[PDB]
Amino acid sequence: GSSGSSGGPDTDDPRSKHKFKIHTYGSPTFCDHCGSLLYGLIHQGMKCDTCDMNVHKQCVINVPSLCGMDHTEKRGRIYLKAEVA
Numbered sequence: 693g694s695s696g697s698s699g700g701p702d703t704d705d706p707r708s709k710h711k712f713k714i715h716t717y718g719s720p721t722f723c724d725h726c727g728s729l730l731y732g733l734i735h736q737g738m739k740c741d742t743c744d745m746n747v748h749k750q751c752v753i754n755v756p757s758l759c760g761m762d763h764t765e766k767r768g769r770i771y772l773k774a775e776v777a
């Protein structure tokens with residue numbers, strides 16, 4: 693015997709990563725990182741799916757991967773549109 697000595701897995705944390713998704717807004721929202729009015733017609737900014745944090749497309753890179761904090765009490769609402777053929 694005396695064989696079989698190894699072990700030590702390691703990897704980044706893909707869970708902490710932000711799930712920001714490029715989406716449009718209907719109201720004048722302000723970034724969460726820098727804090728500046730978010731203008732634009734299509735793909736104005738980005739919004740997470742876990743922390744629903746609105747941030748600029750270029751701000752997402754600056755925002756700290758740190759995602760999943762339970763230190764918030766505010767929660768916005770989502771709207772929907774209709775169509776016809």
Ligand SMILES: [Zn+2]
Nearest residue numbers: 710740743759
């Ligand atoms: Zn997030």
Ligand SMILES: [Zn+2]
Nearest residue numbers: 723726748751
């Ligand atoms: Zn920003």
